[PDB]
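User: I need a structural model of Glutathione-specific gamma-glutamylcyclotransferase 2 from Homo sapiens for a docking pre-check later this week. Nothing fancy, just the predicted structure tokens so I can convert them on my end. Input:
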Amino acid sequence: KVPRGSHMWVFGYGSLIWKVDFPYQDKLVGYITNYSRRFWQGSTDHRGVPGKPGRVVTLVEDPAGCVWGVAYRLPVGKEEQVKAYLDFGEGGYRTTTVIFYPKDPTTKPFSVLLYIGTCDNPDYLGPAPLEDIAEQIFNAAGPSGRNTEYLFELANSIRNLVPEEADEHLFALEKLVKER
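Assistant: Understood. Predicted structure tokens for Glutathione-specific gamma-glutamylcyclotransferase 2:
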């Protein structure tokens, strides 16, 4: 209710949806537009290893795109510090500000911080046929666990908060992997 002195939100589209390493005062399910979520990023430190990389999500510019996720509000008075913590966790990523549309119609859309991987990033793999991606995911495991666990968790989370049509690429991939 009462206005706050400062505001900063970060949009989570990947693992942040289910697991967060930073403190937050609020969270909301919603979507951003003009980007699409694709498993075109390689993982060598989480869901895969060097020489056997996993596939994880990254955001790609898509004018007709939509990405359903969770926006997290950084703690008031600690936003700048928390951001720094995040900035330091991320190769050549870039941050941008975008409009976040809450699932709840009662809350008005607002600006959020978004972290996006560049082509320049060393782990970027790029597009590949779904069957191949699914295969790579099925066989990959890294310091944080199996790649399949990451895909399934993301799928479960999205499903829990919205219909399956919300993300065709994700659901399709899950199906291909589940076919096993």
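Before docking, keep this in mind: The helical segments are 79-89, 130-139, 147-161, 168-178.
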